[PDB]
């Protein structure tokens, strides 16, 4: 009878102008923490959800409820249950609104119009104030849920709200430090768990994106004797048409960019990860996700523009810190592809980042594949996806600075070759990603080496010749038979040195004389 | 440097032959061979300050171990460790937000234990395969013979891996991945598999180096950190010796969002440390607790985490340390009383100890308590900080009543009667009269009335002087207050001395006689049919005293019994309404249950009365009352009230003599059960032993039943009808006459002795 009176009233008084205020009133006085009356809050509340679903056609309901919210968290210029039910209820309302819009996916982990701008701003900033003051008395599920409804309302308001009018520098700073620093994000009890961090990232990406747009026909046969059969059949047909009417009635319904301050905040964060107060991996992954949403592609320009101090801090902390997993190596490589796609605001950024030797050291660490924690050092390959990303990375570097100076980069790459083949190097001992090595060397083959210094080419050729000679002479005593292997790598290196010796010598003399002189 | 390394290792190791075990043992030996505590605590405190500090359970265990000696605690206090740990409390409590499943998760649970998720997803590959791999995704395809394969892939010579991308409809908290190769012919098993995940379903990224899998019948990839993944790409590398794949079944084990170590790393590790500090030695805890007292927000955070559900395993330590700090200083004690009343069972027990422990501040504490209760009751009677005054918990009021009663019983140092003025009595009377009888707060305030009048018989005498007691019309609230307040011995004595029960018995009997006369014909004051059941109920509560039961079995009360029986059997349907008939019949049920309870003289007297009324039964249909009385009165097993006391914990509004807390227990149970049952519901090994205050050093047997015990008390000078039997529980030592006494005769056998069964069978 509750559902039935609800459906009658929604089909009669649903369109009432006081309907939203009436709903706000009854919701306020039924569920109060001071309300001692015992009633099935769950069933009547879901019924309330259903009648609000029918009443969505009326516009005043949403305004009245957010007005109740505005008057509700006024003591935060706290009764957690009031907020919990009402936010889940409005979440259901927004979910049905979203499905209606879709039929005419970021939120899929839960389901198994125009609004006044100022009051929307007021209620959202009050919600943010509620977010920043969360102790043990509140829990994570309500937090993630209020964040999700926040994202939904933010997308709902026309025009979409921007972060400049939402937070200032201290609030954003507090948000980033709670989100990323390793003083609050240590171990498995990282804030609200993984579901919570994922939702926080989800809301952040959506807000930035918004900123940047019958019955059987049977009857008793024995009654045919009397003349009153017509009475029963007319009663039956009235009754069944009425039943149809009732099902029809039930089924039918009732007819100013924040980017500069954001960059400042990230620069502050990079300056604070030096004191080992922030985990690097979470920062980089979140940054690349926030920059990437504008599928991965090397041609995607990141929205977030970084700083020189940022890259210098990043490289020095990675160079100092050893034993970074393959997961974070691929993430780092992806982030470096993205910064290579970036320009800086006039010497190029790629030349500056390549110039210092900490890049040399990190690339050496990556390609050496030591893995000191590897109980399963069977195949040190990093996998084709990472190698292909590395190929795109080197291609981006080459295509961006080939116009200005490929020669200095050629000298750097030869320095990498020399260090990877020097005494106690990775290549001789055979560790490190074989696929990455063959891909880098084959990509190296296609480069032009016109004005490379004689000293470094001589050093690399002597080193590789000594290494390969000691390898061939001291070759293995057995060979097993049952595809790429290191034999192709030696073949490719000798092909490269063949390319090298075919070059005329810069002041038509050739380098063949130089390699001849060193006996 | 080395110390920093090893302490960091302890802060990053797991709980329970292990590397952590090895480091723990070597550090233990380091402590064993160390000379003085100063150079061992120095690296420790540099590590906490430099770290915030990373603390694991082995580290907690070591801190407990290194603080075994008294000198260890003394040195800890000397070099200012307690201030730093209190600072750690402030930072940790302020830092981490609760992650426990709250009400929200409960309400979200019904809106729609490792769960498979394989059928729900959709599979694809970067190369067109002749058959789709959805057969692997089935929950359980037939695996009994495995003829060729459930699914297969053919490798081109130029290619060495195949990527199988599973798109799940939604991201799930993946727990473990299991891959089943073709068991019959695993020569086609892939050499290595490289798993890639995507939380967002687009950013696909590798997890680790491809794990070798050739020659494996069961592919298990344990995930140490459970991952929220919406898309997985499985790059299966080419087998060592085959160009084909044989796969049997893929299963996706995980959890949805709502489908010990998680608490230890939080503040409770230092809380247990604090518990060791304040409780391992009770003599050095004082001045260091004083030093640990003025730290900011200690009480607020401590109370907040006590209110948290995480205290369920270790709450005892919390209230013990709270009690100790409260007793240590008066001002902080009053402040924490205020924050626990203005800003649960544990609170009740806190108040119990606060009232009960004897110290110079006890008078100030009870003064503050009386001020609090007066303010709260005044606020309730007239209609932020006042919120605690709006609804004072009735359990707390009963606790105050128990404290007052027991303070009266125990030989207290102060003069407790001095703090109870007549103004408090008048105020309590107005409070009691201000609310109706349906809720229990009135019951609580009249329990307070009973305890104080037990303290002050003259105050009870004054109470008689208000309602015309030295015609008479008393509202139900008056009856409730008198019944509740008369349970104490002095009050029941003055009630007996007053002529009020005699006059109301005579007036009620006259009304019953008049009603019988009216039915059969179809200073005196009358009683209407509405109030007869409540006044009979009033008789039931006041009949709890044994002397009251003895007085009830006299000739002064038998006319009421005869008149009521005649009225409710012979007077068939001044007209009895059916609802009032049911009310008064239940009142008679309770009254007759109370009369025959543990009173042999009353038992035999009522046996005589029942034989008398059955002999004079009309000659032949059984009335409803006689039928139901036969079904009820002498078919129920005799029930007696047991009261238990014990210094140890043992696991409602009652009379204040029963005390409060879980340390004092009170139940009403049939005598057929034995002591083994009541102990069950609650090599040298401590064993619970029952003792009695009358019994001088003999434990009680577990299989020793309660009817025999009641006879033993009656044989050892106990007044007839004493309803509650007190039993204290002790801890004896066990290395790994009483039963032969006659049981109670019971009213049923007493009645059946002189052949009432023949009479009722004739009347049947």
Q: Which of residues 379-408 of A touch B (CB under 8 A)?
A: 379-386
Residues of A in contact with B169 (CB under 8 A): 108
Residue B435 carries which DSSP code? S
Cα B305 to Cα A81, B122, B269, B518, distances in angstroms: 19, 46, 13, 68
Q: Is B209 on the interface with A (CB under 8 A)?
A: yes
Cβ atoms of A210 and A106 within 8 Å: the answer is no
Give the minimum alpha-carbon distance from B94 to chain A in angstroms, rounded to a whole number: 6
Q: Is B94 on the interface with A (CB under 8 A)?
A: yes
Find the helix packing angle between A280-292 and A169-180, rounded to 10°.
120
Q: Which residue pairs, CB below 8 angstroms and at least 24 apart, start in A485-494?
A: A485/A434, A486/A430, A486/A434, A488/A438, A489/A434, A489/A437, A489/A438, A489/A441, A492/A438, A492/A441, A492/A442, A492/A445, A493/A441, A493/A464, A493/A468, A494/A468
Cβ atoms of B198 and B234 within 8 Å: the answer is no
Number of H helices, E strands in chain B: 34, 13
Structure token pair of residue B560: 């009421």
Cβ atoms of B245 and B190 within 8 Å: the answer is yes
Q: Do A139 and B100 touch (CB under 8 A)?
A: yes
Tell me which residue in A108, A136, A198 faces B304 most closely, judged by beta carbons: A136
What are the residues whose beta carbons fall under 8 Å from the beta carbon of A54, sequence distance 6 or more? A7, A10, A14, A253, A254
**CA–CA distance, B432 with B453 (Å, rounded to integer):** 15
Say if residue B471 is exposed, middle or buried (CB neighbours under 10 Å; 0-12, 13-18, 19+). exposed
The CA angle B466-B467-B470, to the nearest 5 degrees, is 80
Structure token pair of residue B48: 């906490």
Q: CB count, 10 Å around CB of B42?
A: 12
Q: Do B266 and A379 touch (CB under 8 A)?
A: no
Q: Which of residues 477-506 of A touch B (CB under 8 A)?
A: 482-484
Element (H, E) at B514: helix B500-520
Three-class SS of residue B735? strand
Three-class SS of residue B691? strand
**CA–CA distance, B264 with B270 (Å, rounded to integer):** 9
Give the minimum alpha-carbon distance from B342 to chain A in angstroms, rounded to a whole number: 15
Q: For CA atoms B296, B302, B307, B311, give the dihedral sign.
A: positive
Residue of A nearest to B158 (CA): A483
Tell me which residue in A139, A374, A483 faces B160 most closely, judged by beta carbons: A483
Q: Are β-strands B161-181 and B151-154 bridged in parallel, bridged antiparallel, or unpaired?
A: unpaired
Residue among B201, B196, B194, B195 nearest B171 (CA)? B201
Residue A504 carries which DSSP code? B
Q: CB count, 10 Å around CB of A306?
A: 21
Tell me which residue in A135, A195, A295 faces B202 most closely, judged by beta carbons: A295
Residue among B81, B252, B243 nearest B180 (CA)? B252
Cβ atoms of A82 and A34 within 8 Å: the answer is no
Q: CB count, 10 Å around CB of B191?
A: 20
Q: How many CA atoms lie within 13 A of A503 on its CB side?
A: 22
Q: Do A385 and B225 touch (CB under 8 A)?
A: no
Residue A221 carries which DSSP code? G
Residue B567 carries which DSSP code? H
Cβ atoms of A301 and A294 within 8 Å: the answer is yes
Torsion of the alpha carbons at B421, B422, B423 and B425, rounded to the nearest 10:
110
Element (H, E) at A462: helix A454-473
φ/ψ of A279, rounded to 5, equals: -80, 130
Q: Is B227 on the interface with A (CB under 8 A)?
A: yes
Q: Do B99 and A135 touch (CB under 8 A)?
A: no
**CA–CA distance, A302 with A343 (Å, rounded to integer):** 10
Q: Are β-strands B724-735 and B639-645 bridged in parallel, bridged antiparallel, or unpaired?
A: parallel
Q: Do B98 and A136 touch (CB under 8 A)?
A: yes
Chain B interface, mutation test: which of A31, A76, A132, A136, most B Cβ atoms within 10 Å? A136
Chain A interface, mutation test: which of B121, B201, B205, B214, most A Cβ atoms within 10 Å? B205
Residues of A in contact with B170 (CB under 8 A): 108-109, 112
Three-class SS of residue B227? strand
Residue among B218, B224, B20, B178 nearest A325 (CA)? B224
β-bridge mates for residue B602, sequence order: none
Residues of A in contact with B228 (CB under 8 A): 194-195, 198
Residue tagged 């922030």 (tokens): A278
Cβ atoms of A434 and A381 within 8 Å: the answer is yes
Residue B599 carries which DSSP code? -
Q: Is A256 on the interface with B (CB under 8 A)?
A: no
Element (H, E) at B57: helix B57-66
Residues of A in contact with B304 (CB under 8 A): 135-137
Tell me which residue in A109, A376, A384 faces B211 most closely, judged by beta carbons: A376
Three-class SS of residue B226? strand
Three-class SS of residue B240? coil
Q: Is B225 on the interface with A (CB under 8 A)?
A: yes
Q: Is A468 on the interface with B (CB under 8 A)?
A: no
Residue among B249, B179, B253 nearest B216 (CA)? B179
Residue among B184, B205, B208, B185 nearest B196 (CA)? B205
Q: For CA atoms B300, B306, B311, B315, give the dihedral sign.
A: positive
Tell me which residue in A110, A296, A374 faces B203 most closely, judged by beta carbons: A296
φ/ψ of A218, rounded to 5, equals: -130, 150
Give the minimum alpha-carbon distance from B266 to chain A in angstroms, rounded to a whole number: 9
Q: CB count, 10 Å around CB of B705?
A: 18
Q: For CA atoms B336, B340, B344, B350, give the dihedral sign.
A: positive
Q: Is A132 on the interface with B (CB under 8 A)?
A: no
Q: What DSSP letter does each residue of A371-425 carry, written as one string? A: -TT-TT-S-----HHHHHHHHHHHHHHHHHHTTT-HHHHHHHHHHHHHHHSSTT-
Q: What's the longest Cα–Cα distance across chain A?
A: 130
What are the residues whose beta carbons fall under 8 Å from the beta carbon of A174, sequence distance 6 or more? A132
Residue tagged 């970067």 (tokens): B126
Cβ atoms of A406 and A448 within 8 Å: the answer is yes
Structure token pair of residue B247: 């796969």
Structure token pair of residue A250: 């039930």
φ/ψ of B242, rounded to 5, equals: -135, 155
Q: What DSSP letter does each residue of B604-625 carry, written as one string? A: HHHHHHHHHHHHT----PPPHH
Find the helix packing angle between B394-409 and B345-356, rounded to 10°.
20
Torsion of the alpha carbons at B218, B224, B226 and B228, rounded to the nearest 10:
-90
Find the helix packing angle between B422-433 and B457-464, rounded to 10°.
50
β-bridge mates for residue B688, sequence order: B731
Residues of B in contact with A295 (CB under 8 A): 202
Q: Do B228 and A198 touch (CB under 8 A)?
A: yes
β-bridge mates for residue B640, sequence order: B669
Q: What's the longest Cα–Cα distance across chain B?
A: 120
Structure token pair of residue B362: 């006890």
Give the minimum alpha-carbon distance from B300 to chain A in angstroms, rounded to a whole number: 12
**CA–CA distance, B445 with B52 (Å, rounded to integer):** 50
Q: Do B205 and A192 touch (CB under 8 A)?
A: no
**CA–CA distance, B381 with B385 (Å, rounded to integer):** 18
Q: What DSSP letter does each residue of A233-292 carry, written as one string? A: HHHHHHHHHHHHHHHHHHHS-----SHHHHHHHHHHHHHHHTTT-B-HHHHHHHHHHHHH
Cβ atoms of B597 and B638 within 8 Å: the answer is yes
Q: Is A84 on the interface with B (CB under 8 A)?
A: yes
Residue tagged 């690399």 (tokens): A460
Residue of B nearest to A387 (CA): B206
- Binning chain A into helix, strand and coil, the percentages to the nearest 5 are 65, 0, 35
Cα A206 to Cα A90, A140, A149, A158, A160, distances in angstroms: 19, 20, 12, 15, 10
Resolution in angstroms comes to: 7.2
**CA–CA distance, A93 with A115 (Å, rounded to integer):** 15
Residues of A in contact with B261 (CB under 8 A): 188
Residue tagged 């009421």 (tokens): B560
Structure token pair of residue A192: 């609200």
Find the helix packing angle between A140-156 and A80-103, rounded to 10°.
40
Tell me which residue in B96, B170, B240 faces A109 most closely, judged by beta carbons: B170
**CA–CA distance, B434 with B452 (Å, rounded to integer):** 19
β-bridge mates for residue A61, sequence order: none
Tell me which residue in A136, A327, A378 faces B305 most closely, judged by beta carbons: A136
Give the minimum alpha-carbon distance from A316 to chain B in angstroms, rounded to a whole number: 22
**CA–CA distance, B112 with A434 (Å, rounded to integer):** 50
Cα B623 to Cα A466, B568, B570, distances in angstroms: 120, 9, 8
E strands in B65-106:
none
Residue of A nearest to B200 (CA): A106
β-bridge mates for residue B684, sequence order: B735
Structure token pair of residue B123: 């599979």
């Amino acid at each position: 009878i509750r559902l039935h009176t609800g459906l009658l009233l929604v089909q009669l008084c649903g369109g009432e102008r006081w309907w939203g205020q009436f709903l706000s009133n009854v919701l306020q006085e039924l569920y109060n923490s001071e309300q001692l009356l015992i009633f099935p809050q769950d069933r009547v509340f879901m019924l309330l959800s259903c009648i609000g679903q029918r009443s969505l056609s009326n516009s005043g309901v949403l305004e009245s409820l957010l007005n109740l919210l505005d008057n509700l968290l006024s003591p935060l210029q706290l009764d957690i249950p009031m907020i919990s039910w009402v936010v889940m209820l409005v979440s259901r309302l927004l979910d049905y609104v979203a499905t209606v819009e879709d039929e005419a996916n970021q939120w899929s982990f839960i389901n198994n119009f125009t609004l006044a701008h100022e009051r929307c701003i007021s209620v959202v900033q009050k919600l943010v104030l509620f977010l920043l003051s969360m102790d043990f008395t509140c829990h994570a599920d309500l937090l993630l849920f209020v964040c999700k409804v926040l994202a939904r309302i933010a997308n709902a308001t026309r025009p979409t709200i921007h972060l400049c009018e939402i937070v200032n520098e201290p609030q954003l700073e507090r948000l980033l430090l709670l989100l990323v620093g390793t003083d609050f994000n240590r171990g498995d009890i990282s804030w609200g768990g993984a579901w919570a961090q994922y939702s926080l990232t989800c809301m952040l990406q959506d807000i930035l994106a918004g900123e940047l747009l019958s019955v059987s026909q049977a009857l008793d046969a024995r009654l045919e004797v009397g003349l009153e059969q017509q009475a029963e059949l007319m009663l039956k047909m009235m009754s069944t048409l009425e039943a149809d009417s009732i099902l029809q009635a039930l089924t039918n319904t009732s007819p100013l960019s924040s980017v500069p301050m954001l960059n400042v905040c990230f620069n502050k964060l990079f300056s604070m990860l030096q004191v080992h107060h922030v985990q690097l991996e979470s920062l980089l992954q979140l940054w690349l996700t926030l920059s990437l949403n504008s599928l991965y592609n090397a041609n995607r320009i990141p929205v977030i523009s970084l700083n020189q101090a940022s890259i210098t801090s990043f490289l020095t902390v990675l160079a100092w810190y050893p034993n970074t997993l393959l997961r974070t190596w691929c993430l780092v490589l992806h982030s470096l592809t993205l910064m290579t796609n970036m320009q800086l605001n006039q010497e190029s950024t790629a030349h500056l980042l390549v110039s210092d030797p900490n890049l040399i050291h990190v690339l050496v660490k990556f390609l050496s594949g030591t893995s000191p924690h590897g109980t399963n050092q069977h195949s040190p390959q990093v996998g084709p996806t990472a190698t292909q990303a590395m190929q795109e990375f080197l291609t981006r570097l080459q295509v961006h600075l080939s116009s200005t100076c490929p020669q200095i980069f050629s000298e750097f790459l030869l320095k990498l070759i020399h260090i990877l083949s020097t005494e106690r190097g990775a290549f001789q001992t055979g560790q490190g990603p074989l696929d990455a090595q063959v891909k880098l060397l084959e990509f190296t083959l296609e480069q032009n080496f016109e004005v490379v210094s004689v000293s470094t080419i001589s050093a690399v050729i002597e080193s590789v010749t000594f290494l390969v000679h000691h390898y061939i002479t001291c070759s293995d005593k057995v060979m097993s038979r049952s595809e790429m292997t290191r034999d192709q790598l030696m073949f490719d290196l000798l092909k490269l040195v063949n390319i090298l010796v075919q070059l005329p010598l810069s002041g038509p003399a050739y380098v063949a004389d130089l390699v001849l002189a060193n006996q | 440097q080395i110390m920093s390394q090893i302490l960091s290792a302890l802060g990053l190791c797991n709980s329970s032959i292990s590397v952590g075990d090895g480091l723990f043992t070597i550090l233990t030996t380091l402590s064993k061979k160390a000379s003085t505590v100063h150079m061992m605590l120095q690296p420790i405190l540099t590590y906490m300050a430099c770290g915030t500090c990373q603390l694991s359970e082995p580290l907690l265990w070591f801190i407990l171990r290194v603080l075994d000696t008294s000198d260890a605690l003394k040195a800890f206090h000397d070099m200012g460790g307690v201030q730093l740990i209190c600072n750690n409390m402030v930072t940790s409590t302020r830092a981490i937000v609760n992650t426990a499943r709250s009400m929200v998760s409960t309400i979200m649970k019904f809106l729609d234990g490792i769960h498979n998720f394989a059928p729900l997803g959709t599979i694809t590959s970067s190369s067109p395969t002749a058959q789709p791999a959805e057969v692997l995704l089935q929950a359980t395809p037939p695996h009994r013979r495995a003829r060729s394969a459930a699914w297969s892939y053919i490798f081109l010579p130029e290619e060495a891996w195949c990527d199988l991308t599973i798109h799940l409809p939604a991201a799930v908290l993946l727990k473990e991945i299991h891959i089943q190769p073709h068991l019959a012919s695993l020569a086609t098993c892939p050499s290595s598999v490289s798993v890639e995940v995507s939380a967002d379903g687009v950013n696909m990224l590798p997890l680790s180096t491809p794990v070798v899998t050739s020659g494996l019948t069961y592919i298990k990839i344990q995930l140490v950190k459970a991952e929220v993944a919406s898309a997985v790409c499985l790059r299966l590398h080419r087998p060592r010796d085959a160009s084909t794949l044989g796969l049997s079944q893929i299963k996706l084990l995980g959890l949805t969002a709502f489908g010990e170590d998680q608490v230890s790393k939080t503040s409770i590790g230092w809380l247990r440390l604090l518990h060791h500090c304040l409780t391992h030695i009770s003599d050095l805890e004082g001045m260091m607790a004083s030093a640990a007292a003025p730290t900011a927000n200690l009480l607020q955070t401590c109370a907040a985490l006590l209110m948290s559900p995480y205290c369920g395993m270790h709450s005892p330590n919390i209230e013990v340390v709270l009690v100790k700090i409260g007793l240590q200083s008066t001002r902080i004690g009053l402040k924490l009383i205020d924050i626990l009343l203005r800003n649960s069972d544990s609170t009740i027990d806190i108040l119990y100890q606060l009232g009960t422990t004897q110290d110079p501040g006890t008078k100030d504490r009870i003064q503050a308590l009386l001020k609090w209760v007066s303010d709260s009751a005044r606020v309730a009677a007239m209609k932020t900080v006042e919120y605690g005054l709006l609804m004072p918990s009735p359990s707390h009021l009963h606790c105050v009543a128990a404290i007052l009663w027991h303070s009266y019983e125990l030989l207290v140092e102060y003069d407790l009667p001095a703090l109870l003025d007549q103004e408090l009595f008048e105020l309590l009377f107005n409070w009691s009269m201000s609310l109706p009888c349906n809720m229990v707060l009135k019951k609580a305030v009249d329990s307070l009335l009973c305890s104080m009048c037990h303290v002050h018989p003259n105050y009870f005498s004054l109470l008689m002087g208000w309602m015309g007691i030295t015609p008479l019309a008393l509202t139900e609230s008056h009856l409730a207050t008198l019944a509740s307040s008369s349970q104490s011995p002095e009050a029941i004595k003055q009630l007996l001395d007053s002529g009020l029960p005699s006059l109301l018995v005579r007036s009620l009997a006259s009304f019953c006689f008049s009603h019988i006369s009216s039915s059969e014909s179809i200073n005196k004051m009358p009683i209407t049919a509405d109030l007869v059941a409540p006044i009979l109920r009033f008789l039931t509560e006041v009949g709890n005293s044994h002397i009251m039961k003895d007085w009830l079995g006299g000739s002064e009360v038998n006319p009421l019994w005869t008149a009521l029986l005649f009225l409710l059997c012979h007077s068939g349907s001044t007209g009895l309404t059916t609802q009032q008939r049911t009310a008064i019949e239940n009142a008679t049920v309770a009254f007759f249950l109370q009369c025959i309870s543990c009173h042999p003289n009353n038992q035999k007297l009522m046996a005589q009365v029942l034989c008398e009324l059955f002999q004079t039964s009309p000659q032949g249909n059984i009335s409803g009352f006689i039928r139901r009385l036969f079904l009820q009165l002498m078919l129920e097993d005799e029930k007696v009230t047991m009261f238990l006391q014990s210094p140890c914990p043992l696991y409602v509004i009652q009379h204040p003599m029963y005390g409060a807390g879980h340390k004092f227990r009170t139940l009403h149970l049939p005598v057929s059960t034995t002591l083994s049952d009541v102990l069950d519901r609650v090599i040298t090994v401590p064993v619970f032993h029952l003792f009695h205050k009358l019994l001088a050093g003999q434990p009680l047997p577990a299989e020793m039943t309660l009817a025999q015990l009641l006879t033993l008390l009656y044989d050892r000078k106990l007044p007839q009808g004493y309803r509650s039997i007190d039993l204290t529980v002790k801890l004896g030592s066990r290395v790994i006459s009483l039963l032969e006494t006659c049981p109670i005769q019971s009213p049923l056998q007493v009645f059946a002795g002189m052949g009432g069964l023949a009479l009722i069978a004739e009347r049947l």
